[PDB]
Amino acid sequence: MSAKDERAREILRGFKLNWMNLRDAETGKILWQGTEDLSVPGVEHEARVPKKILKCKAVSRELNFSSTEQMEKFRLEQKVYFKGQCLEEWFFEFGFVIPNSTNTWQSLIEAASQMMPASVLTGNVIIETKFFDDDLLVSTSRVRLFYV
Numbered sequence: 001m002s003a004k005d006e007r008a009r010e011i012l013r014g015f016k017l018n019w020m021n022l023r024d025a026e027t028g029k030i031l032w033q034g035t036e037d038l039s040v041p042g043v044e045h046e047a048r049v050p051k052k053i054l055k056c057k058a059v060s061r062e063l064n065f066s067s068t069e070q071m072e073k074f075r076l077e078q079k080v081y082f083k084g085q086c087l088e089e090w091f092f093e094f095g096f097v098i099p100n101s102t103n104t105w106q107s108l109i110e111a112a113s114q115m116m117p118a119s120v121l122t123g124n125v126i127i128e129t130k131f132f133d134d135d136l137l138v139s140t141s142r143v144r145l146f147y148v
C-alpha cells in the first residue's frame with residue numbers, strides 16, 4: 001500500500017459524476033443524457049444510444065462532476081472495445097480541479113476508418129474510461145452500449 005495508492009482512493013472517494021449528455025456536433029442536438037454515475041468502477045453499466053450516432057463525424061460531450069479533492073491534472077483515457085479488441089482511443093485533459101468544486105467539462109469527440117453497422121455492434125461494444133490525476137490511476141469504469 002503506497003502513498004500514491006492511498007491518494008487515488010481518496011480522490012475516488014470524493015469523486016462524483018452528476019450528469020452527462022452527448023450531442024451531434026453539427027445539429028447541436030441531444031443524442032443521450034443521463035444522471036447515472038457511469039464512472040462507477042466494478043460494475044458493467046449499460047447504456048442505450050441512438051443508431052444515428054454512428055453516422056456522426058463528431059460528438060460533443062458535456063459532463064458535470066464534483067470532487068472534494070484537489071487534482072493537478074485531471075484527464076481521461078477512453079477506448080472502444082468490440083468483442084474484446086480495441087478499435088479506437090482518445091485522451092482528454094481537463095487539468096486543474098479545485099477542491100469542493102463542481103465543474104462542467106465540454107469535449108469534442110471525432111471518429112478516426114469505417115463503421116460496422118449498429119445491428120452488429122449492439123451489445124458487443126464496451127467503452128472503457130480510465131480516470132487519472134496526471135499519472136495516477138484513480139478509476140477504471142466500463143459501459144456496454146446498445147444501439148437503438
Ligand SMILES: O=C1c2ccccc2N[C@@H](c2ccccc2F)N1c1ccccc1
Nearest residue numbers: 020022032038039047061078109127129143
Ligand atoms: O465520455 C464518455 C463517458 C464519460 C464518463 C463516463 C463514461 C463515459 N462513457 C462514454 C459514454 C458517454 C455517454 C453515454 C454512454 C457512454 F458509454 N463516454 C464516451 C462518449 C463518446 C466517446 C467515448 C466515450
Ligand SMILES: O=C1c2ccccc2N[C@@H](c2ccccc2F)N1c1ccccc1
Nearest residue numbers: 049053054056057058080087088109110111
Ligand atoms: O459507439 C461508438 C463507436 C463504435 C464503433 C467505433 C467507434 C465508436 N466511437 C464512438 C463514436 C461513434 C461515432 C462518432 C464518433 C465516435 F467517437 N462511439 C460512441 C457512441 C456513443 C457513446 C460513446 C461512443
